Amino acid sequence: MNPYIYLGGAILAEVIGTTLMKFSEGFTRLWPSVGTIICYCASFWLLAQTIAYIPTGIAYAIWSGVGIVLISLLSWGFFGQRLDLPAIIGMMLICAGVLIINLLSRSTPH
Amino acid sequence: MNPYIYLGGAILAEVIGTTLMKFSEGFTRLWPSVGTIICYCASFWLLAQTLAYIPTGIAYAIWSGVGIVLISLLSWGFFGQRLDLPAIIGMMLICAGVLIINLLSRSTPH
């Protein structure tokens, strides 16, 4: 198995499940609810396998960060949900602070 | 309703479930896994409520972004150790990002 294939599959499942949950308007449609559960369980299963070959903090940072970008892009196209420039700057400020926290984590004793 | 209390609840459920998952190490992890599943399911419900008011990527970004700071503090030992100066700077960037999302962007039913 290739870990990039698993990590990207985990992200793909995360984006699809989160989009499906938003599309369904919460947990309120049976087939959406079942699909949402399968997507998150698959995403976690792929993550659990992945972290044996990619660092756990790096894998989480890639999984969350790429996921947010793909969810934002897919929401913009599928729902017509446009983001304001301070909101776009705001998520990037969160990413910049998260990078500092990740570096502090990566420089902590092993 | 107020989405920020639900989003904070989702973050709290994420942190508590993660804490239980981290410190259960037994011969079988059955009963702590069951509690972990409940905490993660609660986090997803609370996130699903949040997505009604807050943009899809932005809500996910706050949920991961405030979550990783709490998880990082849990990892390092909370107030059990001397708090780093760049950690404060990283938290300030995350807080600044949240502040412009909160006050220069709208949270309303969509």
JSON list of N, CA, C and O in Angstrom, two decimals, chain B residues 41-91:
[
{"chain": "B", "resi": 41, "resn": "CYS", "atom": "N", "xyz": [-19.45, 10.88, 18.04]},
{"chain": "B", "resi": 41, "resn": "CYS", "atom": "CA", "xyz": [-20.80, 11.05, 17.52]},
{"chain": "B", "resi": 41, "resn": "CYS", "atom": "C", "xyz": [-21.48, 12.34, 17.95]},
{"chain": "B", "resi": 41, "resn": "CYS", "atom": "O", "xyz": [-22.09, 13.05, 17.15]},
{"chain": "B", "resi": 42, "resn": "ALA", "atom": "N", "xyz": [-21.34, 12.71, 19.25]},
{"chain": "B", "resi": 42, "resn": "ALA", "atom": "CA", "xyz": [-21.78, 13.99, 19.76]},
{"chain": "B", "resi": 42, "resn": "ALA", "atom": "C", "xyz": [-21.10, 15.17, 19.09]},
{"chain": "B", "resi": 42, "resn": "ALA", "atom": "O", "xyz": [-21.76, 16.15, 18.72]},
{"chain": "B", "resi": 43, "resn": "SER", "atom": "N", "xyz": [-19.77, 15.09, 18.85]},
{"chain": "B", "resi": 43, "resn": "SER", "atom": "CA", "xyz": [-19.02, 16.12, 18.13]},
{"chain": "B", "resi": 43, "resn": "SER", "atom": "C", "xyz": [-19.53, 16.34, 16.71]},
{"chain": "B", "resi": 43, "resn": "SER", "atom": "O", "xyz": [-19.78, 17.47, 16.30]},
{"chain": "B", "resi": 44, "resn": "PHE", "atom": "N", "xyz": [-19.78, 15.26, 15.95]},
{"chain": "B", "resi": 44, "resn": "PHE", "atom": "CA", "xyz": [-20.41, 15.32, 14.64]},
{"chain": "B", "resi": 44, "resn": "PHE", "atom": "C", "xyz": [-21.82, 15.89, 14.61]},
{"chain": "B", "resi": 44, "resn": "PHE", "atom": "O", "xyz": [-22.15, 16.69, 13.74]},
{"chain": "B", "resi": 45, "resn": "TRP", "atom": "N", "xyz": [-22.70, 15.54, 15.58]},
{"chain": "B", "resi": 45, "resn": "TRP", "atom": "CA", "xyz": [-24.01, 16.18, 15.70]},
{"chain": "B", "resi": 45, "resn": "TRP", "atom": "C", "xyz": [-23.93, 17.69, 15.94]},
{"chain": "B", "resi": 45, "resn": "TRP", "atom": "O", "xyz": [-24.60, 18.49, 15.30]},
{"chain": "B", "resi": 46, "resn": "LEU", "atom": "N", "xyz": [-23.06, 18.11, 16.87]},
{"chain": "B", "resi": 46, "resn": "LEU", "atom": "CA", "xyz": [-22.82, 19.50, 17.20]},
{"chain": "B", "resi": 46, "resn": "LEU", "atom": "C", "xyz": [-22.21, 20.30, 16.05]},
{"chain": "B", "resi": 46, "resn": "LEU", "atom": "O", "xyz": [-22.59, 21.43, 15.77]},
{"chain": "B", "resi": 47, "resn": "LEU", "atom": "N", "xyz": [-21.27, 19.68, 15.29]},
{"chain": "B", "resi": 47, "resn": "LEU", "atom": "CA", "xyz": [-20.79, 20.20, 14.03]},
{"chain": "B", "resi": 47, "resn": "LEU", "atom": "C", "xyz": [-21.89, 20.34, 12.98]},
{"chain": "B", "resi": 47, "resn": "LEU", "atom": "O", "xyz": [-22.01, 21.38, 12.34]},
{"chain": "B", "resi": 48, "resn": "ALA", "atom": "N", "xyz": [-22.79, 19.35, 12.83]},
{"chain": "B", "resi": 48, "resn": "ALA", "atom": "CA", "xyz": [-23.93, 19.38, 11.93]},
{"chain": "B", "resi": 48, "resn": "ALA", "atom": "C", "xyz": [-24.91, 20.54, 12.20]},
{"chain": "B", "resi": 48, "resn": "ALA", "atom": "O", "xyz": [-25.36, 21.20, 11.27]},
{"chain": "B", "resi": 49, "resn": "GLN", "atom": "N", "xyz": [-25.20, 20.83, 13.49]},
{"chain": "B", "resi": 49, "resn": "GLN", "atom": "CA", "xyz": [-25.92, 22.02, 13.90]},
{"chain": "B", "resi": 49, "resn": "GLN", "atom": "C", "xyz": [-25.22, 23.33, 13.51]},
{"chain": "B", "resi": 49, "resn": "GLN", "atom": "O", "xyz": [-25.82, 24.28, 13.02]},
{"chain": "B", "resi": 50, "resn": "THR", "atom": "N", "xyz": [-23.88, 23.35, 13.68]},
{"chain": "B", "resi": 50, "resn": "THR", "atom": "CA", "xyz": [-23.02, 24.49, 13.34]},
{"chain": "B", "resi": 50, "resn": "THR", "atom": "C", "xyz": [-23.06, 24.86, 11.86]},
{"chain": "B", "resi": 50, "resn": "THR", "atom": "O", "xyz": [-23.12, 26.03, 11.49]},
{"chain": "B", "resi": 51, "resn": "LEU", "atom": "N", "xyz": [-23.07, 23.85, 10.95]},
{"chain": "B", "resi": 51, "resn": "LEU", "atom": "CA", "xyz": [-23.06, 24.03, 9.51]},
{"chain": "B", "resi": 51, "resn": "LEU", "atom": "C", "xyz": [-24.28, 24.76, 8.95]},
{"chain": "B", "resi": 51, "resn": "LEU", "atom": "O", "xyz": [-24.24, 25.33, 7.87]},
{"chain": "B", "resi": 52, "resn": "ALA", "atom": "N", "xyz": [-25.41, 24.78, 9.69]},
{"chain": "B", "resi": 52, "resn": "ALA", "atom": "CA", "xyz": [-26.59, 25.56, 9.34]},
{"chain": "B", "resi": 52, "resn": "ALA", "atom": "C", "xyz": [-26.34, 27.06, 9.28]},
{"chain": "B", "resi": 52, "resn": "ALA", "atom": "O", "xyz": [-26.90, 27.76, 8.43]},
{"chain": "B", "resi": 53, "resn": "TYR", "atom": "N", "xyz": [-25.49, 27.60, 10.18]},
{"chain": "B", "resi": 53, "resn": "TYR", "atom": "CA", "xyz": [-25.26, 29.03, 10.33]},
{"chain": "B", "resi": 53, "resn": "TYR", "atom": "C", "xyz": [-23.94, 29.49, 9.74]},
{"chain": "B", "resi": 53, "resn": "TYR", "atom": "O", "xyz": [-23.84, 30.58, 9.18]},
{"chain": "B", "resi": 54, "resn": "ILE", "atom": "N", "xyz": [-22.87, 28.67, 9.88]},
{"chain": "B", "resi": 54, "resn": "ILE", "atom": "CA", "xyz": [-21.52, 29.08, 9.53]},
{"chain": "B", "resi": 54, "resn": "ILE", "atom": "C", "xyz": [-21.15, 28.43, 8.20]},
{"chain": "B", "resi": 54, "resn": "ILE", "atom": "O", "xyz": [-21.48, 27.26, 8.00]},
{"chain": "B", "resi": 55, "resn": "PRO", "atom": "N", "xyz": [-20.54, 29.12, 7.21]},
{"chain": "B", "resi": 55, "resn": "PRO", "atom": "CA", "xyz": [-19.92, 28.51, 6.03]},
{"chain": "B", "resi": 55, "resn": "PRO", "atom": "C", "xyz": [-19.16, 27.20, 6.25]},
{"chain": "B", "resi": 55, "resn": "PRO", "atom": "O", "xyz": [-18.43, 27.08, 7.23]},
{"chain": "B", "resi": 56, "resn": "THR", "atom": "N", "xyz": [-19.33, 26.22, 5.34]},
{"chain": "B", "resi": 56, "resn": "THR", "atom": "CA", "xyz": [-18.94, 24.83, 5.53]},
{"chain": "B", "resi": 56, "resn": "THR", "atom": "C", "xyz": [-17.46, 24.63, 5.83]},
{"chain": "B", "resi": 56, "resn": "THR", "atom": "O", "xyz": [-17.08, 23.90, 6.75]},
{"chain": "B", "resi": 57, "resn": "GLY", "atom": "N", "xyz": [-16.56, 25.31, 5.08]},
{"chain": "B", "resi": 57, "resn": "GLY", "atom": "CA", "xyz": [-15.13, 25.21, 5.28]},
{"chain": "B", "resi": 57, "resn": "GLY", "atom": "C", "xyz": [-14.66, 25.94, 6.51]},
{"chain": "B", "resi": 57, "resn": "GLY", "atom": "O", "xyz": [-13.81, 25.46, 7.26]},
{"chain": "B", "resi": 58, "resn": "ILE", "atom": "N", "xyz": [-15.24, 27.13, 6.77]},
{"chain": "B", "resi": 58, "resn": "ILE", "atom": "CA", "xyz": [-14.95, 27.98, 7.92]},
{"chain": "B", "resi": 58, "resn": "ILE", "atom": "C", "xyz": [-15.28, 27.30, 9.25]},
{"chain": "B", "resi": 58, "resn": "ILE", "atom": "O", "xyz": [-14.48, 27.30, 10.17]},
{"chain": "B", "resi": 59, "resn": "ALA", "atom": "N", "xyz": [-16.45, 26.65, 9.35]},
{"chain": "B", "resi": 59, "resn": "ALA", "atom": "CA", "xyz": [-16.86, 25.89, 10.52]},
{"chain": "B", "resi": 59, "resn": "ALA", "atom": "C", "xyz": [-15.93, 24.74, 10.84]},
{"chain": "B", "resi": 59, "resn": "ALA", "atom": "O", "xyz": [-15.52, 24.54, 11.99]},
{"chain": "B", "resi": 60, "resn": "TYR", "atom": "N", "xyz": [-15.53, 23.97, 9.81]},
{"chain": "B", "resi": 60, "resn": "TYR", "atom": "CA", "xyz": [-14.58, 22.88, 9.91]},
{"chain": "B", "resi": 60, "resn": "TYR", "atom": "C", "xyz": [-13.20, 23.39, 10.36]},
{"chain": "B", "resi": 60, "resn": "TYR", "atom": "O", "xyz": [-12.55, 22.82, 11.24]},
{"chain": "B", "resi": 61, "resn": "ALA", "atom": "N", "xyz": [-12.73, 24.52, 9.79]},
{"chain": "B", "resi": 61, "resn": "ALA", "atom": "CA", "xyz": [-11.48, 25.16, 10.13]},
{"chain": "B", "resi": 61, "resn": "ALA", "atom": "C", "xyz": [-11.38, 25.62, 11.58]},
{"chain": "B", "resi": 61, "resn": "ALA", "atom": "O", "xyz": [-10.38, 25.38, 12.24]},
{"chain": "B", "resi": 62, "resn": "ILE", "atom": "N", "xyz": [-12.43, 26.26, 12.13]},
{"chain": "B", "resi": 62, "resn": "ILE", "atom": "CA", "xyz": [-12.49, 26.58, 13.55]},
{"chain": "B", "resi": 62, "resn": "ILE", "atom": "C", "xyz": [-12.51, 25.34, 14.44]},
{"chain": "B", "resi": 62, "resn": "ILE", "atom": "O", "xyz": [-11.79, 25.25, 15.44]},
{"chain": "B", "resi": 63, "resn": "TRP", "atom": "N", "xyz": [-13.30, 24.30, 14.07]},
{"chain": "B", "resi": 63, "resn": "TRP", "atom": "CA", "xyz": [-13.39, 23.05, 14.78]},
{"chain": "B", "resi": 63, "resn": "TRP", "atom": "C", "xyz": [-12.07, 22.27, 14.90]},
{"chain": "B", "resi": 63, "resn": "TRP", "atom": "O", "xyz": [-11.68, 21.82, 15.98]},
{"chain": "B", "resi": 64, "resn": "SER", "atom": "N", "xyz": [-11.32, 22.13, 13.79]},
{"chain": "B", "resi": 64, "resn": "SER", "atom": "CA", "xyz": [-9.95, 21.64, 13.81]},
{"chain": "B", "resi": 64, "resn": "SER", "atom": "C", "xyz": [-8.97, 22.58, 14.49]},
{"chain": "B", "resi": 64, "resn": "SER", "atom": "O", "xyz": [-8.15, 22.17, 15.32]},
{"chain": "B", "resi": 65, "resn": "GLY", "atom": "N", "xyz": [-9.03, 23.90, 14.19]},
{"chain": "B", "resi": 65, "resn": "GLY", "atom": "CA", "xyz": [-8.07, 24.90, 14.63]},
{"chain": "B", "resi": 65, "resn": "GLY", "atom": "C", "xyz": [-8.03, 25.19, 16.11]},
{"chain": "B", "resi": 65, "resn": "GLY", "atom": "O", "xyz": [-6.96, 25.30, 16.71]},
{"chain": "B", "resi": 66, "resn": "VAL", "atom": "N", "xyz": [-9.19, 25.30, 16.77]},
{"chain": "B", "resi": 66, "resn": "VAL", "atom": "CA", "xyz": [-9.25, 25.44, 18.21]},
{"chain": "B", "resi": 66, "resn": "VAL", "atom": "C", "xyz": [-9.01, 24.09, 18.88]},
{"chain": "B", "resi": 66, "resn": "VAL", "atom": "O", "xyz": [-8.40, 24.00, 19.96]},
{"chain": "B", "resi": 67, "resn": "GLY", "atom": "N", "xyz": [-9.42, 22.99, 18.22]},
{"chain": "B", "resi": 67, "resn": "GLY", "atom": "CA", "xyz": [-9.22, 21.63, 18.68]},
{"chain": "B", "resi": 67, "resn": "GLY", "atom": "C", "xyz": [-7.77, 21.22, 18.80]},
{"chain": "B", "resi": 67, "resn": "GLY", "atom": "O", "xyz": [-7.36, 20.68, 19.83]},
{"chain": "B", "resi": 68, "resn": "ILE", "atom": "N", "xyz": [-6.94, 21.50, 17.77]},
{"chain": "B", "resi": 68, "resn": "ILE", "atom": "CA", "xyz": [-5.51, 21.21, 17.80]},
{"chain": "B", "resi": 68, "resn": "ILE", "atom": "C", "xyz": [-4.77, 21.94, 18.90]},
{"chain": "B", "resi": 68, "resn": "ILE", "atom": "O", "xyz": [-3.88, 21.38, 19.52]},
{"chain": "B", "resi": 69, "resn": "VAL", "atom": "N", "xyz": [-5.12, 23.21, 19.22]},
{"chain": "B", "resi": 69, "resn": "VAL", "atom": "CA", "xyz": [-4.53, 23.93, 20.34]},
{"chain": "B", "resi": 69, "resn": "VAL", "atom": "C", "xyz": [-4.79, 23.23, 21.68]},
{"chain": "B", "resi": 69, "resn": "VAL", "atom": "O", "xyz": [-3.86, 22.98, 22.45]},
{"chain": "B", "resi": 70, "resn": "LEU", "atom": "N", "xyz": [-6.04, 22.83, 21.96]},
{"chain": "B", "resi": 70, "resn": "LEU", "atom": "CA", "xyz": [-6.40, 22.06, 23.13]},
{"chain": "B", "resi": 70, "resn": "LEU", "atom": "C", "xyz": [-5.75, 20.68, 23.20]},
{"chain": "B", "resi": 70, "resn": "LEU", "atom": "O", "xyz": [-5.23, 20.27, 24.23]},
{"chain": "B", "resi": 71, "resn": "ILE", "atom": "N", "xyz": [-5.72, 19.94, 22.07]},
{"chain": "B", "resi": 71, "resn": "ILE", "atom": "CA", "xyz": [-5.02, 18.66, 21.94]},
{"chain": "B", "resi": 71, "resn": "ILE", "atom": "C", "xyz": [-3.51, 18.80, 22.15]},
{"chain": "B", "resi": 71, "resn": "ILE", "atom": "O", "xyz": [-2.87, 18.00, 22.83]},
{"chain": "B", "resi": 72, "resn": "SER", "atom": "N", "xyz": [-2.88, 19.86, 21.59]},
{"chain": "B", "resi": 72, "resn": "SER", "atom": "CA", "xyz": [-1.46, 20.17, 21.81]},
{"chain": "B", "resi": 72, "resn": "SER", "atom": "C", "xyz": [-1.14, 20.47, 23.26]},
{"chain": "B", "resi": 72, "resn": "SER", "atom": "O", "xyz": [-0.18, 19.94, 23.82]},
{"chain": "B", "resi": 73, "resn": "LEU", "atom": "N", "xyz": [-1.98, 21.28, 23.94]},
{"chain": "B", "resi": 73, "resn": "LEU", "atom": "CA", "xyz": [-1.88, 21.51, 25.37]},
{"chain": "B", "resi": 73, "resn": "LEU", "atom": "C", "xyz": [-2.04, 20.24, 26.20]},
{"chain": "B", "resi": 73, "resn": "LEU", "atom": "O", "xyz": [-1.27, 19.99, 27.12]},
{"chain": "B", "resi": 74, "resn": "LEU", "atom": "N", "xyz": [-3.01, 19.36, 25.85]},
{"chain": "B", "resi": 74, "resn": "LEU", "atom": "CA", "xyz": [-3.16, 18.03, 26.41]},
{"chain": "B", "resi": 74, "resn": "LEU", "atom": "C", "xyz": [-1.92, 17.16, 26.24]},
{"chain": "B", "resi": 74, "resn": "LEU", "atom": "O", "xyz": [-1.48, 16.48, 27.17]},
{"chain": "B", "resi": 75, "resn": "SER", "atom": "N", "xyz": [-1.32, 17.19, 25.04]},
{"chain": "B", "resi": 75, "resn": "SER", "atom": "CA", "xyz": [-0.06, 16.51, 24.72]},
{"chain": "B", "resi": 75, "resn": "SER", "atom": "C", "xyz": [1.11, 16.99, 25.57]},
{"chain": "B", "resi": 75, "resn": "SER", "atom": "O", "xyz": [1.90, 16.19, 26.08]},
{"chain": "B", "resi": 76, "resn": "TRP", "atom": "N", "xyz": [1.27, 18.31, 25.74]},
{"chain": "B", "resi": 76, "resn": "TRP", "atom": "CA", "xyz": [2.38, 18.88, 26.48]},
{"chain": "B", "resi": 76, "resn": "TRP", "atom": "C", "xyz": [2.19, 18.87, 27.99]},
{"chain": "B", "resi": 76, "resn": "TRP", "atom": "O", "xyz": [3.17, 18.93, 28.74]},
{"chain": "B", "resi": 77, "resn": "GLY", "atom": "N", "xyz": [0.94, 18.78, 28.48]},
{"chain": "B", "resi": 77, "resn": "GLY", "atom": "CA", "xyz": [0.64, 18.65, 29.92]},
{"chain": "B", "resi": 77, "resn": "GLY", "atom": "C", "xyz": [-0.05, 19.82, 30.53]},
{"chain": "B", "resi": 77, "resn": "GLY", "atom": "O", "xyz": [0.08, 20.06, 31.74]},
{"chain": "B", "resi": 78, "resn": "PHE", "atom": "N", "xyz": [-0.83, 20.61, 29.76]},
{"chain": "B", "resi": 78, "resn": "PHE", "atom": "CA", "xyz": [-1.56, 21.80, 30.22]},
{"chain": "B", "resi": 78, "resn": "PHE", "atom": "C", "xyz": [-0.73, 22.81, 31.02]},
{"chain": "B", "resi": 78, "resn": "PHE", "atom": "O", "xyz": [0.27, 23.32, 30.52]},
{"chain": "B", "resi": 79, "resn": "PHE", "atom": "N", "xyz": [-1.11, 23.12, 32.27]},
{"chain": "B", "resi": 79, "resn": "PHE", "atom": "CA", "xyz": [-0.41, 24.10, 33.09]},
{"chain": "B", "resi": 79, "resn": "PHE", "atom": "C", "xyz": [0.68, 23.43, 33.91]},
{"chain": "B", "resi": 79, "resn": "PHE", "atom": "O", "xyz": [1.33, 24.06, 34.75]},
{"chain": "B", "resi": 80, "resn": "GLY", "atom": "N", "xyz": [0.96, 22.14, 33.66]},
{"chain": "B", "resi": 80, "resn": "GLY", "atom": "CA", "xyz": [1.99, 21.36, 34.31]},
{"chain": "B", "resi": 80, "resn": "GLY", "atom": "C", "xyz": [3.40, 21.72, 33.91]},
{"chain": "B", "resi": 80, "resn": "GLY", "atom": "O", "xyz": [4.36, 21.28, 34.52]},
{"chain": "B", "resi": 81, "resn": "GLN", "atom": "N", "xyz": [3.55, 22.54, 32.86]},
{"chain": "B", "resi": 81, "resn": "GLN", "atom": "CA", "xyz": [4.83, 23.00, 32.34]},
{"chain": "B", "resi": 81, "resn": "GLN", "atom": "C", "xyz": [4.79, 24.49, 32.01]},
{"chain": "B", "resi": 81, "resn": "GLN", "atom": "O", "xyz": [3.71, 25.07, 31.85]},
{"chain": "B", "resi": 82, "resn": "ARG", "atom": "N", "xyz": [5.96, 25.14, 31.92]},
{"chain": "B", "resi": 82, "resn": "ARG", "atom": "CA", "xyz": [6.13, 26.55, 31.58]},
{"chain": "B", "resi": 82, "resn": "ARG", "atom": "C", "xyz": [5.66, 26.86, 30.16]},
{"chain": "B", "resi": 82, "resn": "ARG", "atom": "O", "xyz": [6.19, 26.33, 29.19]},
{"chain": "B", "resi": 83, "resn": "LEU", "atom": "N", "xyz": [4.65, 27.75, 30.00]},
{"chain": "B", "resi": 83, "resn": "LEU", "atom": "CA", "xyz": [4.07, 28.04, 28.70]},
{"chain": "B", "resi": 83, "resn": "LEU", "atom": "C", "xyz": [4.96, 28.90, 27.80]},
{"chain": "B", "resi": 83, "resn": "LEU", "atom": "O", "xyz": [5.39, 29.98, 28.16]},
{"chain": "B", "resi": 84, "resn": "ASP", "atom": "N", "xyz": [5.28, 28.38, 26.60]},
{"chain": "B", "resi": 84, "resn": "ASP", "atom": "CA", "xyz": [6.14, 29.01, 25.62]},
{"chain": "B", "resi": 84, "resn": "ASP", "atom": "C", "xyz": [5.61, 30.33, 25.05]},
{"chain": "B", "resi": 84, "resn": "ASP", "atom": "O", "xyz": [4.44, 30.48, 24.70]},
{"chain": "B", "resi": 85, "resn": "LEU", "atom": "N", "xyz": [6.52, 31.31, 24.86]},
{"chain": "B", "resi": 85, "resn": "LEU", "atom": "CA", "xyz": [6.23, 32.57, 24.20]},
{"chain": "B", "resi": 85, "resn": "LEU", "atom": "C", "xyz": [5.72, 32.46, 22.75]},
{"chain": "B", "resi": 85, "resn": "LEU", "atom": "O", "xyz": [4.71, 33.10, 22.42]},
{"chain": "B", "resi": 86, "resn": "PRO", "atom": "N", "xyz": [6.25, 31.64, 21.83]},
{"chain": "B", "resi": 86, "resn": "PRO", "atom": "CA", "xyz": [5.68, 31.51, 20.49]},
{"chain": "B", "resi": 86, "resn": "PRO", "atom": "C", "xyz": [4.34, 30.79, 20.49]},
{"chain": "B", "resi": 86, "resn": "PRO", "atom": "O", "xyz": [3.58, 30.99, 19.56]},
{"chain": "B", "resi": 87, "resn": "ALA", "atom": "N", "xyz": [4.03, 29.94, 21.50]},
{"chain": "B", "resi": 87, "resn": "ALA", "atom": "CA", "xyz": [2.72, 29.33, 21.62]},
{"chain": "B", "resi": 87, "resn": "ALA", "atom": "C", "xyz": [1.61, 30.35, 21.78]},
{"chain": "B", "resi": 87, "resn": "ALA", "atom": "O", "xyz": [0.56, 30.27, 21.15]},
{"chain": "B", "resi": 88, "resn": "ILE", "atom": "N", "xyz": [1.86, 31.39, 22.61]},
{"chain": "B", "resi": 88, "resn": "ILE", "atom": "CA", "xyz": [0.99, 32.55, 22.79]},
{"chain": "B", "resi": 88, "resn": "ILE", "atom": "C", "xyz": [0.78, 33.30, 21.48]},
{"chain": "B", "resi": 88, "resn": "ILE", "atom": "O", "xyz": [-0.35, 33.62, 21.12]},
{"chain": "B", "resi": 89, "resn": "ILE", "atom": "N", "xyz": [1.86, 33.54, 20.70]},
{"chain": "B", "resi": 89, "resn": "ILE", "atom": "CA", "xyz": [1.79, 34.17, 19.39]},
{"chain": "B", "resi": 89, "resn": "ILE", "atom": "C", "xyz": [0.94, 33.36, 18.39]},
{"chain": "B", "resi": 89, "resn": "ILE", "atom": "O", "xyz": [0.10, 33.90, 17.69]},
{"chain": "B", "resi": 90, "resn": "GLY", "atom": "N", "xyz": [1.10, 32.02, 18.35]},
{"chain": "B", "resi": 90, "resn": "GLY", "atom": "CA", "xyz": [0.30, 31.12, 17.53]},
{"chain": "B", "resi": 90, "resn": "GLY", "atom": "C", "xyz": [-1.17, 31.15, 17.86]},
{"chain": "B", "resi": 90, "resn": "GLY", "atom": "O", "xyz": [-2.03, 31.23, 16.98]},
{"chain": "B", "resi": 91, "resn": "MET", "atom": "N", "xyz": [-1.52, 31.11, 19.17]},
{"chain": "B", "resi": 91, "resn": "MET", "atom": "CA", "xyz": [-2.87, 31.29, 19.66]},
{"chain": "B", "resi": 91, "resn": "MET", "atom": "C", "xyz": [-3.49, 32.65, 19.32]},
{"chain": "B", "resi": 91, "resn": "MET", "atom": "O", "xyz": [-4.64, 32.73, 18.91]}
]
